[PDB]
Amino acid sequence: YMESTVASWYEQGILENIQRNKLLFIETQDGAETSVALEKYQEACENGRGAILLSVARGKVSEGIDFVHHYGRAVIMFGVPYVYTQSRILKARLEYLRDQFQIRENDFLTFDAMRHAAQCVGRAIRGKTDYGLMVFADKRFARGDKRGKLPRWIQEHLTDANLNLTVDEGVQVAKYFLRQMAQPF
Amino acid sequence: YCELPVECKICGLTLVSAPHLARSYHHLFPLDAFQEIPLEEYNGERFCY
């Protein structure tokens, strides 16, 4: 989906406008290539160029990278991260949890998606009291059950004013939040 | 020259009138803050001095 999305954005002007506005990097299964790209992404963020990092939620980079001020200041999540439900690994795991531990298929599958999303997205806050933004591009996250499965600190900071924002509203609220965070405490 | 203060176009030296320097002396004489008395505090001076 990432490549398809990037290819679609490359057929369109979207990918050119993005790269023109800020450098962009994309992660792959290769640890070395992603390490270099991530170092270049960070070095781009040190300089005036800045950089954009596109990655797969389940990718090794997401579980290994730590986000800090000016290094992943904002994290975008495109959709609820659901693994391919036809995979035999998922089938065996999910049916066993229902057969032995009695957890429903969609219950655990959503829990693992909610957990993995929060894991990849919540890493924006780590310490030193540095601000960060977490935008979820899916109305699914705004559903009553998904909200309850979301962690309490996210769930309580989340509110109806930012629960079902339009793309434009997200950019406007983000710009305001950035203005409000730039001053000292 | 018609306008001062200005740097010499030749000597590279600043030409200026004495009042222009005094215009900066408030930086050298920072004014002490006056103590606040928001309440009337029985001050008989109804008129502000």
Binding site: - | R23, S24, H27, L28
Partner: protein
């Protein structure tokens, strides 16, 4: 504290695409330039 009486300052202003943005109420380019004319005058007025 001690203060540097004489000072030489260069004002750097972006001429980039974002200056045309209506980020404030007026156009950012118009707003910044209008307020800079005031700041430039006040700069000499105080130094």
């Amino acid at each position: 504290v001690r203060l540097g009486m004489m000072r030489h300052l260069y004002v750097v202003v972006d001429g980039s695409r974002t200056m045309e943005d209506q980020d404030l109420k007026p156009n950012r380019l118009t707003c910044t330039l209008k307020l800079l004319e005031y700041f430039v005058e006040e700069y000499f007025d105080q130094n």
